[PDB]
Amino acid sequence: GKQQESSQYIHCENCGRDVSANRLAAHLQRCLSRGARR
């Protein structure tokens, strides 16, 4: 292994999705933006 980034998919609590923990914050920006629940 070398090019294998440990992106690590974890369970987002915001949409309930398997998303990279390494990208969870940027994801959350998109996630929270989209997840405007009313």
Residues that bind Zn ion (CB under 5 A): 12, 14-15, 17, 31
Q: Give the DSSP letter string of 1-38.
A: --S-----EEE-SSS--EEETTSHHHHHHHHHHH----
Token reading at 32: 């929270």
Indicate the annotated binding residues for Zn(2+): 12, 15, 27, 31
Indicate the annotated binding residues: 12, 15, 27, 31
Residue with Cβ nearer Zn ion (12 or 21) = 12
- State the minimum distance, in angstroms, from the CB of residue 19 to Zn ion: 6
The single-letter code of the amino acid at 31 is C
Residue with Cβ nearer Zn ion (6 or 28) = 28
